[PDB]
Amino acid sequence: GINTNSTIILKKSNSDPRKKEAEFKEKNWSQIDKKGLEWQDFTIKIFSLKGDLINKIQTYLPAFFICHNFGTRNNKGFGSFTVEYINNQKNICNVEDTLKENFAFVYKKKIALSRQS
RNA sequence: AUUAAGACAUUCGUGAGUGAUUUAUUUCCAUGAAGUGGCGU
């Protein structure tokens, strides 16, 4: 918008007024309340002196990460994570089967990619 | 003038020597910085 605190400061342009330019300020971006972040592959460690609980957790962890979203506005798709390796073993979980198992209604959208994106 | 008289149970002597109020005990357990758009029909 137009204020001294906005990270993207929209300013009048010498071009056609119907189009507006933008300015990026690092100080405002450094003090924003929340940021959308994407990381590379990272580690979740679970420690327990109960071995049977660890086995049960290994059984249920992929389903848990397939069922719940994390972060702010997690209803709308932010913070989606899936399990790739468990104890240096790849995990093969049918996402649709897990979603069907743990949810009442499931719907899938016909998304498309035009061979370039 | 009498089987009598005379005579400090007294001198010396440190209640003292060696001795950590110490061994042991997690200021812990629980918990989503998160909920939500609306008009422009």
| Through-space separation of residue A70 CA and nucleotide B31 C1' in angstroms | 16
The resolution in angstroms reads 3.0
Q: Which two tokens stand for residue A21?
A: 């330019």
Q: Using only C-alpha atoms, what is the Rg of chain A?
A: 22
* Chain B bases near protein CB atoms (7 A cut-off): 32-36
| Through-space separation of residue A69 CA and nucleotide B3 C1' in angstroms | 133
| Through-space separation of residue A58 CA and nucleotide B8 C1' in angstroms | 104
Kindly list the protein residues whose beta carbon lies within 7 Å of any strand B atom.
A 34, 68-75, 79
Asked if A19 and A13 touch (Cβ cutoff 8 Å), the reply is: yes
User: Rounded to 5 degrees, what angle do the CA atoms A20, A26, A32 make?
Assistant: 90
Structure method: cryo-EM
Q: How far apart are CA A15 and CA A23, in angstroms?
A: 15
DSSP string computed for chain A = --STT-SEEEE--SS-TTS-EEEE-HHHHHT-S-------S-------S-HHHHHHHHHHHHHHHHH---STTGGGT-S-----BSSS-B----HHHHHHHH-S----------S--
Q: How many Å separate Cα A105 from the centre of its chain?
A: 22
